[PDB]
Chains A and B, each alone.
Chain A
Amino acid sequence: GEELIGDGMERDYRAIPELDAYEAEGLALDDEDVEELTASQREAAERAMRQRD
């Protein structure tokens, strides 16, 4: 049974530059043009996903 408002609030809202931004690793290696889904590509996916029992 914990409480959420009062002393110690300020501390929860501190800025941590190190954690407040996204890492290079995991993200796309370069700014290359990415192929966006057509109606066919979207449907064949949507059909398969429903067909997942």
Chain B
Amino acid sequence: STELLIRKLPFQRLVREIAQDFKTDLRFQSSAVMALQEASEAYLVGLFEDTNLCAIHAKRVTIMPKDIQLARRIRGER
């Protein structure tokens, strides 16, 4: 059940920082932070797959931000 992608302490402290922009006295469940972490890791791993293809299309091994932006644009994220 163990997965080392984003570290647990720096992830929590970022979720805690982002929630502060929206509301004070917010507490998270251990389960809630774990849900957002699996979600973020799954989104980014999946987007890294799609950006990888965009590079290959431009016939490159080295991934560039133009590939991240394309992948996101086709998904309808911009």
Direct contact of A and B (CB under 8 A): yes
Residues of chain A at the chain B interface (Cβ within 8 Å)? 1-2, 13, 15-16, 18-23, 26-29, 34
Residues of chain B at the chain A interface (Cβ within 8 Å)? 4, 7-10, 12-13, 15-16, 27-30, 33, 62
**Contact A22 B30, CB 8 Å, known A13-B4, A16-B7:** yes
- Majority secondary structure, A binding face: loop
Query: For A2, A13, A20, A29, which residue has the most chain B Cβ atoms within 10 angstroms?
Result: A20
Question: Is the Cβ of B9 less than 8 Å from the Cβ of A22?
Answer: yes
Question: Is the Cβ of B62 less than 8 Å from the Cβ of A27?
Answer: no
Question: Is the Cβ of A26 less than 8 Å from the Cβ of B7?
Answer: no
Question: Is the Cβ of A27 less than 8 Å from the Cβ of B33?
Answer: yes
Q: Per a CB cutoff under 8 Å, which of A2, A20, A26 touches B8? A: A20
Question: Inside 8 A of A2's CB, which chain B residues have their CB?
Answer: 62
